[PDB]
Amino acid sequence: TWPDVPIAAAPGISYFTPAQSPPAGTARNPQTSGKAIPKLFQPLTIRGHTFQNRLGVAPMCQYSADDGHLTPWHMAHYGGIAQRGPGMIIIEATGVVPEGRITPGCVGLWKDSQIAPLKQVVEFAHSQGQKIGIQLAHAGRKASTVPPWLGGVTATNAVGGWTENVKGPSAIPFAEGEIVPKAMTKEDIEEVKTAWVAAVERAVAAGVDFIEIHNAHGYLLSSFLSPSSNQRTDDYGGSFENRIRLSLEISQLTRDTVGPNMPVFLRVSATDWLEKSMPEEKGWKLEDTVEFSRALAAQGAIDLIDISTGGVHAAQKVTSGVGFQVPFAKAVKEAVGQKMLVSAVGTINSGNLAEKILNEDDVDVILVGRAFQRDSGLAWAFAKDLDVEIAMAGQIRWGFTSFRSEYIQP
Amino acid sequence: TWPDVPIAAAPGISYFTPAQSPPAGTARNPQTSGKAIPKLFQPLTIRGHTFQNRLGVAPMCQYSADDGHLTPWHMAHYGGIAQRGPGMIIIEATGVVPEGRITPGCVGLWKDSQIAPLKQVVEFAHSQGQKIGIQLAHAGRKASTVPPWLGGVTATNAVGGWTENVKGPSAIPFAEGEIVPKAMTKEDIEEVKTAWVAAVERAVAAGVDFIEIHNAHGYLLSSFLSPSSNQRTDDYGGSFENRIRLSLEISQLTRDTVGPNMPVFLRVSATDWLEKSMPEEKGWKLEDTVEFSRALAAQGAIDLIDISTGGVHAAQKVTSGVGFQVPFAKAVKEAVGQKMLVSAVGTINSGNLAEKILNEDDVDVILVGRAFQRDSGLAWAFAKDLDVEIAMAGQIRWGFTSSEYIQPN
Ligand SMILES: Cc1cc2nc3c(=O)[nH]c(=O)nc-3n(C[C@H](O)[C@H](O)[C@H](O)COP(=O)(O)O)c2cc1C
Ligand SMILES: Cc1cc2nc3c(=O)[nH]c(=O)nc-3n(C[C@H](O)[C@H](O)[C@H](O)COP(=O)(O)O)c2cc1C
Ligand SMILES: [Cl-]
Ligand SMILES: [Cl-]
């Protein structure tokens, strides 16, 4: 006596959940308003993948991993964001070796047991049509510390640390009183590259849509760049060519393992923020980052440079503020044009400023961090900031619309 | 060389996650600002349990369960809320029998396999210091329908329905053209009572902190109250006492089963909204809800009456607006003073308005629905609107300051 109305399910998974067609965060085309779609909510395609808008979740450590293994905290964290249509999600820094975690709570992928917890989270994200990738990491001489809400102080062995297995380019503590890392041997560098392939391979089995390389914030790769942390006298220190070499190798290796269709990102710290505080230190400035991005666009393996700053030197003096890292992303996009995409991140907390950055600075992707801890639906917020009628999950949307559309007029 | 700093873990569980001392959403007492803590952020104790503030997540159907089983959808939903410190979480309407779900995607607790999926979510919430309970339900003559984003129309058997196993007090479809429900036999009600007791035990086995009885919104118990849906001629129909009889039995059975320490809530539809649209209809109005709340206060089984409205009759005309069901809770609170707790729900979108309802309408709990689907961190939102310094998870809190507490303004 009634028509048959089925509930379409997400494909390829062992549990039922409703499918969202199109995925949450997709601008209706045509907009019901008749207005043009702002640059922020126009899809972007990198190699084999399409992101339905250009707002990404910046990688954010949760310090809640159990021997590198994801827990239901990460299902609640990443999954609540995934239900609300960001354009992409960058999973937090994930250790490629145990001594490459930052803290005892860091995610890791040095082990096959670590794949399936990550795979459960990726799988639910894709049940939502969301794109999810992972930032592989090696904390270097900044490894073995406690989470930041506990001050970020050294994690001793009694409390889970590894103060005797901390490795960097050179025997230089990050600050006085911090762990003196062991200057990595050539075999250590070869061991890190070897572990890097295994971690990339482990991520690929888990189903990630892209890989980001953590080359920023004074961790292992970032510290090879800076002559403040790198005083090696071999093929990996001294000259500018040598200090970007390991970063260049990891980029080729990472490309070579994922093939020609998978997006590969690299995040770098554009400056060490010593311009005023330590002007006589030959460190790492925007000029160095621009020459670095020139080698990476020339090399052709990395698709997107994620520009961050600082963490490279303890004496940094960070000039914070709204969008305080956009100037560096603007200059790097200027250096590489369309050969490389560039993303911006850092105190970008309105949709209007996000759109302003994409158009006036020619940035490709807008990443937001903290605000996604506060607003798991920040993509919902930025669309409202921009008045974009967007798609949202049928479970969420039906109480924000009339009794009788797949899109939300925010 | 270096001081020893361990990361305390949540106790009694097989996975590491940082412990939250105090649970998120706890107003610092005393506030560092010296200001007083509003009632919305004053803890609440019901029998064996203490809630760290009075903001609750109202029950909200997700229509995404797998043969009644919770999925990672529910861990992302409830668990993302749980990280952000509400005073309580009321899990959605949970069917006690298969045919008592609303839709094929509704949760259930008629079967033992459904406990462990529930237990993973309750166990993650409790890792955060969260209080979490469940709304048990039976969709009645409004059962076997599709989710609301697909129109809420009948679900035929071809798409997962059970159009021949839909039961209510009387064989009266909810609207014209809808499924004609089967009029329950004496055995039908006893099977519900048997099924209800078992579902309580399954909920208690899953570890919930409280149970709410869904007696609202035109589902099974709501349809027994209203003479529009209930024309029975036995102990469950006719007189007003007969129409509230089943609700009274169900509440005591739950009380006897959960023991003396567990809070038991009951949600009711305070009015059917037929005053203007069907004025000559003997239906269910606030005067009945007050006599029912008085009878439940006399009984002593239920600790909190969850006041809602509507869903009881198809021609309802709901005059909505900000705090639009607050008047009914205000009259019910007056009739039951301190013998029973009372909550209010409905288009309550700021901490300022919430506090206002608490203080001069004297309700005990403020429930919010939609606003939690948008902001899983609404407890943070209402704390800022009221300038209340609250505790927040160390994973969330450390990027908004240079303490365990966050000054939200
Ligand atoms: C809690 C938290 C965790 C973070 N984890 C990482 C990380 O694992 N890797 C990384 O490159 N940056 C990390 N960051 C830095 C952010 O990804 C981002 O670049 C920075 O927060 C941008 O500023 P915003 O959060 O104010 O938008 C983290 C930041 C926060 C607040
Ligand atoms: C998506 C959604 C699902 C709901 N599911 C239930 C439910 O299962 N049981 C119930 O008693 N009320 C349910 N409600 C009603 C809410 O609990 C609440 O009483 C009502 O929505 C008013 O809350 P609000 O105005 O803050 O959204 C639901 C509401 C929404 C929007
Ligand atoms: Cl970082
Ligand atoms: Cl409902």
Residue numbers in the entry:
A (entry chain B): 2 to 405, 408 to 413
B (entry chain A): 2 to 403, 408 to 414
Show me the paper's own sentences about this structure.
PsOYE2 crystallized in the monoclinic space group P21 with four dimers in the asymmetric unit. The crystal structure was determined at a resolution of 2.3 Å. DLS analysis and size exclusion chromatography already suggested that PsOYE2 forms dimers in solution, with estimated molecular weights of 68 kDa and 78 kDa, respectively. The ER fold consists of eight twisted β‐strands surrounded by eight α‐helices, [(β/α)8] or TIM‐barrel structure, as predicted previously using Alphafold2 and in alignment with other Class III enzymes. A substantial portion of the N‐terminus (44 residues) interacts with the neighboring protomer, creating a tightly bound dimer, which might be a characteristic of fungal enzymes. The C‐terminal region is also involved in dimer formation and shapes the FMN binding pocket of the other monomer. The FMN cofactor, situated on the C‐terminal side of the barrel, has interactions through the phosphate group with the side chain of Arg371 and backbone nitrogen atoms of Arg371, Gly370 and Thr348 (of the adjacent protomer). The ribityl part is stabilized by Arg368, and the isoalloxazine on the re face via hydrophobic contacts with Pro60 and Met61, and the backbone carbonyl atom of Pro60 to N5 and N10. The “arginine finger”, a distinctive characteristic of Class III ERs, was observed in PsOYE2 being represented by Arg371. In place of Arg in comparison to YqjM, PsOYE2 exhibited a Trp, which participates in the substrate binding site and might contribute to form a large hydrophobic substrate site, along with Phe, another residue believed to play a role at the same site.
Ene‐reductases (ERs) catalyze the asymmetric reduction of C=C double bonds in α,β‐unsaturated compounds, where the double bond is conjugated to an electron‐withdrawing group (EWG), such as a carbonyl moiety. The mechanism can be dissected into two half‐reactions, the first half‐reaction (reductive half‐reaction) begins with the transfer of a hydride from NAD(P)H to the ER‐bound flavin cofactor, FMN. In the next half‐reaction (oxidative half‐reaction), the reduced flavin transfers a hydride ion to the β‐carbon (the carbon next to the EWG). This is accompanied by a proton transfer to the substrate coming from a tyrosine residue in the active site, being transferred to the α‐carbon.
